[PDB]
Amino acid sequence: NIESGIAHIRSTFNNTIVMITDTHGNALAWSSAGSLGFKGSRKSTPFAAQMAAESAAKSAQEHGLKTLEVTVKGPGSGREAAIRALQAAGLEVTAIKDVTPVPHNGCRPPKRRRV
RNA sequence: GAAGACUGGAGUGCAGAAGAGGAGAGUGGAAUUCCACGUGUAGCGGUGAAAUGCGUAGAUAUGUGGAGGAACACCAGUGGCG
Numbered sequence: 001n002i003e004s005g006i007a008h009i010r011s012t013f014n015n016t017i018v019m020i021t022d023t024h025g026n027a028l029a030w031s032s033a034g035s036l037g038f039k040g041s042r043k044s045t046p047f048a049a050q051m052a053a054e055s056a057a058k059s060a061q062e063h064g065l066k067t068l069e070v071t072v073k074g075p076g077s078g079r080e081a082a083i084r085a086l087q088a089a090g091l092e093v094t095a096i097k098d099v100t101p102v103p104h105n106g107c108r109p110p111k112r113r114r115v
Numbered sequence: 116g117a118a119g120a121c122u123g124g125a126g127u128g129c130a131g132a133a134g135a136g137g138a139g140a141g142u143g144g145a146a147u148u149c150c151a152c153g154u155g156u157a158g159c160g161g162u163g164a165a166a167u168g169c170g171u172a173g174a175u176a177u178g179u180g181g182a183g184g185a186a187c188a189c190c191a192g193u194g195g196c197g
């Protein structure tokens with residue numbers, strides 16, 4: 001029940017999700033700006049991410065772990081706010097990874113807005 | 116108009132070069148979607164704000180595997196070819 005683990009962060013233009021999992025992708029705890037009581041446009045603010053990271057971090061310590069590897073996805077603004085909340089909860093960030101899925105000119109995207 | 120002559124036009128020969136020029140056959144890797152199975156809990160998604168929609172019949176997230184189709188990240192350049 002006590003081990004190491006890795007954290008997945010998905011920061012987009014609407015919401016942020018922090019997923020805390022084992023080395024081989026087995027879920028331990030998660031939280032999101034929606035689950036902290038935010039409803040609409042305020043889901044995406046950096047403050048909402050800072051609470052979301054802390055709530056998952058505290059529930060992570062209950063199982064007991066210290067070292068983390070952080071993977072980052074999405075273009076959201078909560079990348080910086082979320083990671084430093086993990087450190088301020090008493091854990092160590094070993095590495096930072098960017099896993100935004102760039103395609104090699106694959107499927108075409110939805111049309112532009114106001115067209 | 117007719118009979119001859121020439122090589123600065125035009126074309127052939129000889130030695131090199133570059134190119135996303137065209138048609139046919141086969142193959143590759145990212146990524147999206149769907150399907151099956153682990154972990155897991157209450158939201159996800161979306162907007163100027165919202166709502167319709169999806170989710171406790173267990174979603175979003177995450178790890179593994181399978182199927183299929185379309186376009187070819189960097190190179191890439193008032194660069195190239197017709």
Ligand SMILES: [Mg+2]
Nearest residue numbers: 110111113161
């Ligand atoms: Mg859209």
Ligand SMILES: [Mg+2]
Nearest residue numbers: 123124125126
């Ligand atoms: Mg000549």
Ligand SMILES: [Mg+2]
Nearest residue numbers: 134135136137
């Ligand atoms: Mg060719």
Ligand SMILES: [Mg+2]
Nearest residue numbers: 135136137138
């Ligand atoms: Mg061709």
Ligand SMILES: [Mg+2]
Nearest residue numbers: 144145146147
């Ligand atoms: Mg693939």
Ligand SMILES: [Mg+2]
Nearest residue numbers: 040163164165
């Ligand atoms: Mg209003």
Ligand SMILES: [Mg+2]
Nearest residue numbers: 175176177178
């Ligand atoms: Mg899934």
Ligand SMILES: [Mg+2]
Nearest residue numbers: 136195196197
């Ligand atoms: Mg020409």
